[PDB]
Amino acid sequence: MEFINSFNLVMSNIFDNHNNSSIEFWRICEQINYFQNLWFRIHDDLIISSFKLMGSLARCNTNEVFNFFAQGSAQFTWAKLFQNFSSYAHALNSIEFSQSLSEKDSDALSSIFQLISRLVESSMAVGNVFLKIGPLISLAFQFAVSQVDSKLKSSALSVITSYSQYPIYVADIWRLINETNLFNSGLSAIGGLNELSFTQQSLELLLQLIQQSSFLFDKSNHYQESLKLKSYLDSCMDLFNLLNIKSFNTLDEKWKFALTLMKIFEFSIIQFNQSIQNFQIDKQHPCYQLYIELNRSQSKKTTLENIIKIIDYSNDQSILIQQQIQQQQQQQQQGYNQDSSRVILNLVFQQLQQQDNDDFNLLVLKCDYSRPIVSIAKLIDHELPAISLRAIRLIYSFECYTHQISTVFLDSDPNLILSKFIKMMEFNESNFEDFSGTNYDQTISFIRYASNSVQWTIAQLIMLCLSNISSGRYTLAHFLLGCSSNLDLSKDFIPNSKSCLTLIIKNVMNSQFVERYPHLVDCYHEIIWKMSSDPITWKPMIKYIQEEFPNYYHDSLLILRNAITINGSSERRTEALISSMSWVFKTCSISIQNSYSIEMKQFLTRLIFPSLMNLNQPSMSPINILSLYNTIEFQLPEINRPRIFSMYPNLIEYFTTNIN
């Protein structure tokens, strides 16, 4: 029985990860009749491990594990297990009602509850049969309340969490929590290292409940219960303030405990933001306290202070991981800290996405950010694009309120900041396989979207800080493009330097970058055009084009004309390449008008206006004025009137938007 327990415990550890290798293993066990020879007459010492193995298999073999204990051939069956649970619960209840279990019983009832929870994780249909075999939720509450082992309390509470995955049971589970007062122990700040598993499972039950109960934020009917949600949220806030004072067995426990608390706060602020209408911030909302402990200037300051320490510590960790990838087989332990960092960057964005709003600014019209911004800017080159893109889109909103991230980066280390934007703007040709496949997996696509959104968001951040120029102002665009850090914009660029400008022009003249990213090249050419048409920077800009890039007006027209000529392109590739071609013509037009060089003389007279006699010199379709004209195709599309205007003629000016 040492050996059979040993085998069962390692087979449990494999299939617990939802691992589809269980499906071969199950059918192999049936063909060998192994589960029948095990369970027909199982021995007492084998019970604990065999129920853990079944609770792992129950994730992906949910129907087969359920049927095995239903078919009645085994020494245990569902009705007999429910008879054991009700016999043990009535024995607890009658010992406790006489005042007014063994270790093997604890770990066995714990693994039978773990199996019963798993058969509800992966099937409401099995839960909808368990509740017809007996009052399983009420038995689980009795084992969670009565004076038993913390393991058995957490495994009984896990069954309540897997029934709270389904709204049809959430109201009666929530009634039973507030009758049993369960969270008045399960959320205890005071509860010790032995109670940490019951605390974690109570936070996971609270998280799983709020995700299934909009009625806990109501005050028109549920005022008796949104008041009780606040009592649990205010408890979660002092648990989060204690998160650097309370003890854990491992760092992974600490970051799972942090991640559950942060996801309670993430969903609690979403259910706050979604409850404000027509200026009416209801000051009785359960999350209005969390909103006031977050949006704030011992434990009642440490909330935002502990969030900032996790933004700083995720930079300590990204610096330590970019070092320790030279050794780490340890990726499994990073994920809870990485996802805690991702949820923090979601939550700060959901504090800005009430101010990124006309109703708030129209309310204001009726009424040290540097360290936060810089500890976010240090994550621009984070090893997960879903964190990098969060840092860059936070910096986008922060510049909209300030127009001063330029000075905040000069007050800091502008080199260690600008180099992180550059490190994200450098083109890697090997990050490529085509979007021609119809089978758009959302998992793989979200990672490829989170990648390719980085350079688009940096380009749009430079574009915003060029569209918003009141004349002569230095901006975050001028900073990223490498305009003189003396703020005077009328001074030349630094040759052979890396700025975003040196990368923009060198990406524009890469034909594969133009073919792969046409809208990013249209945008890049609008940057080049604006820097060449502002009355101050045009001279530095056109001089810098002629000193480091004299081919630019030939090679860009060559690459764009070839990229348009590729038949089987779509209207939205042709759109951006023809838009990009306008910007090249107008940028060249200012260069001819003010800066006519010997390269411009040779460009016009040998390529654009090629005079016939020159064709006979072997001593050194072309891009002439007429071959350029017919690259634009002056057959315009005959725009048909949308059929929706014939369904809703009263809504034409509601269904359009003026681009200005």
């Binding site: 691992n19 290798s21 060998i32 050794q327």
Partner: protein, 405 residues
């Protein structure tokens, strides 16, 4: 090699597998056969030639070295001094040491002597593994069902890759044979592994020892294996056991993963003696592995040390396999009368459950998911004995075998 390492041969391999013709992939694999059939290249650069005392004068008196495409890299005396110190610190050829220092000056902003020497140390310790990882990615291209769907449209590429490694495994001078090269390289890379003298080099040497056993594992689930290579696997496993006993706590996880994957390579060879089948690189068809000298392999398992639970778990596995080959050979002799009853005793004495044997088999399955299919093949075989022998004989007054089983 000392040129090819700048040419990114893993990106060029993956282009040769994806985008190229079968008529190109075959040419590229045939030239690269000159790096695989020499155990001095496979995980080691061009070590110093005898007249380094000429070459160091030539570099000092030209003030230049050859790059690729015919380029002559002209260099100042401090670069020549740092390249000579790299060539001494790692005993490599001076013309490689200039190329490594050049590539480290191109791909960095750093300019203290130590920055360029540690970046060169990391370039040397990573990029010395190129052909091990080139072999690994072919072996995973032969192993994944999934890239085998992509490649089924061009299936001639899979036949070429399987024939190519088939020629490295069929090779008749044992000392060229890629399985022997992997074995010998594992013996020396494990033998001289020590974190107390250079921990950075030791971490790359750990990654190399893991990837050597991964390549040996993938080969042992894809190809037929010559009977005395099985005897070499058991001897290297015993040398990893006697290494694990001697090194400190820090190296014990890495040595334990190397030791488990070798133990599973020996099981993969053995399942292919009855249940699975693999490409016979000499007959160019699928077959079983043959084991002819049972009592040779059994006395190699008996040369494992008596203190380590791997010995009794390999001895349990080997007695399971012996009984699995015997229980086939009985059945053709079925036209024989009545007299079987006596022999039942012997094939029940072969299995004494030595308690802690299976406890290693537990502790080491905390390992990587590419092993899960071979793990289910082990477990399906294992469950056959659990069902037929152990559950079938648990007594309701349990003895000191029943408390064990």
């Amino acid at each position: 090699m000392d040129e090819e390492i700048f040419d990114n041969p893993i990106q060029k391999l993956n282009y040769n597998i994806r985008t190229e013709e079968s008529g190109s992939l075959l040419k590229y694999l045939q030239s690269q056969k000159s790096n695989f059939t020499d155990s001095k290249k496979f995980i080691s650069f061009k070590q110093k030639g005898n007249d380094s005392v000429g070459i160091r004068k030539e570099i000092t008196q030209k003030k230049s070295f050859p790059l690729d495409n015919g380029f002559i890299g002209t260099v100042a005396d401090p670069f020549i001094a740092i390249a000579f110190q790299i060539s001494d610190r790692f005993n490599i050829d001076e013309y490689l040491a200039c190329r490594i220092l050049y590539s480290v000056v191109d791909h960095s902003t750093t300019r203290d002597e130590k920055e360029l020497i540690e970046l060169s140390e990391k370039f040397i310790y990573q990029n010395r593994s190129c052909y091990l990882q080139f072999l690994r990615e072919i072996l995973h291209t032969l192993q994944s069902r999934d890239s085998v769907n992509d490649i089924n449209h061009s299936k001639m590429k899979h036949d070429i890759l399987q024939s190519f490694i088939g020629e490295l495994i069929s090779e008749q001078t044992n000392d060229k044979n890629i399985v022997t090269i992997l074995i010998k390289t594992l013996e020396e890379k494990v033998k001289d592994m020590n974190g107390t003298v250079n921990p950075l080099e030791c971490c790359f040497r750990v990654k190399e020892c893991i990837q050597i056993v991964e390549c040996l594992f993938l080969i042992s689930i894809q190809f037929t294996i010559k009977e005395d290579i099985i005897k070499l696997y058991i001897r290297v496993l015993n040398q990893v056991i006697e290494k694990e006993k001697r090194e400190d706590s820090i190296l014990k996880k890495s040595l334990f993963e190397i030791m488990f994957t070798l133990y599973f390579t020996i099981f993969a060879v053995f399942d292919n003696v009855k249940n699975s089948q693999v490409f016979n690189a000499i007959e160019k068809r699928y077959t079983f592995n043959e084991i002819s000298s049972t009592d040779s392999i059994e006395n190699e398992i008996k040369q494992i040390d008596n203190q380590h639970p791997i010995k009794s778990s390999l001895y349990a596995i080997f007695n399971i396999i012996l009984i699995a080959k015997e229980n086939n050979n009985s059945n053709s002799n079925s036209n024989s009368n009545s007299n079987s009853n006596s022999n039942s005793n012997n094939n029940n004495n072969r299995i004494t459950p030595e308690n802690d044997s299976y406890k290693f088999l537990l502790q080491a399955v905390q390992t990587q998911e590419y092993q899960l299919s071979p793990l289910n093949i082990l477990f399906g075989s294992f469950i056959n004995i659990l069902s037929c022998r152990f559950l079938s004989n648990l007594s309701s007054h349990p003895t000191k075998k029943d408390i064990l089983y």
